Every structure is written in structure tokens, then in C-alpha cells.
């Protein structure tokens, strides 16, 4: 925050501080929540024709 100092009516005009604005930076990670699977292509038709 920019601190406020104050002065008299006709006193000096010294400065007072400002507030820092930081550039916050994240990134979608280079990583995944992945889940992969290999079905036997045989199983796909077989189970399609056989699953109860």
C-alpha cells in the first residue's frame, strides 16, 4: 500500500511510498493426470458379442 504522510497547508512536498504490484505467474503443468489402457482388439468384438 502507498503509505500516506501528510503535510501542513504550505509545508514541504516530500514524497511518500507507493504500493508494489507483483506479476504472479503460474503455468498449466507439463504433466497429465493420464490413464491409458490397451484393449485387445479381439476382446472388443468378442465381448460385444458375448457380454451378458
Amino acid at each position: 500500500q502507498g503509505v500516506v504522510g501528510g503535510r501542513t497547508r504550505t509545508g514541504a512536498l516530500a514524497n511518500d511510498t507507493q504500493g508494489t504490484i507483483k506479476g504472479a505467474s503460474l503455468s498449466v503443468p507439463d504433466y497429465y493426470i493420464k490413464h491409458q489402457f490397451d484393449v485387445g482388439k479381439d476382446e472388443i468384438v468378442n465381448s460385444d458379442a458375448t457380454g451378458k
Binding site: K41, D42, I44, V45, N46, D48
Partner: protein, 52 residues
């Protein structure tokens, strides 16, 4: 032999002769084509045979 054809082949066990009932001997292939992709990797040429 009593109307049963006696077709022969080279790759038949030597001192044997099989009497087969072709309406009760079958070849079953697993048609896993339905689970193929539609790219073109798989082609499925039907197999060729010769009796002579």
C-alpha cells in the same frame, strides 16, 4: 469308396487315411474386423487355396 471321395494330399500323415464328414468339420475364424480402425492399416485379403 462307397461314394466317399478319397482326395489325397502330400501333407497328410503317412500311414493314415482320415474319413471326414465335411458337414460336421468346420473352420471358425474370429472376425475381429469390426474393432478395426477406419484408417487403412488393415486390409483382410481372403486366403487362396488350390486342390491340385
Amino acid at each position: 469308396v462307397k461314394g466317399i471321395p478319397v482326395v489325397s494330399d502330400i501333407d497328410c500323415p503317412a500311414n493314415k487315411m482320415y474319413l471326414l464328414n465335411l458337414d460336421k468339420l468346420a473352420i471358425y475364424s474370429f472376425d475381429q474386423s469390426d474393432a478395426d480402425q477406419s484408417n487403412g492399416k488393415i486390409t483382410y485379403i481372403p486366403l487362396r487355396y488350390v486342390d491340385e
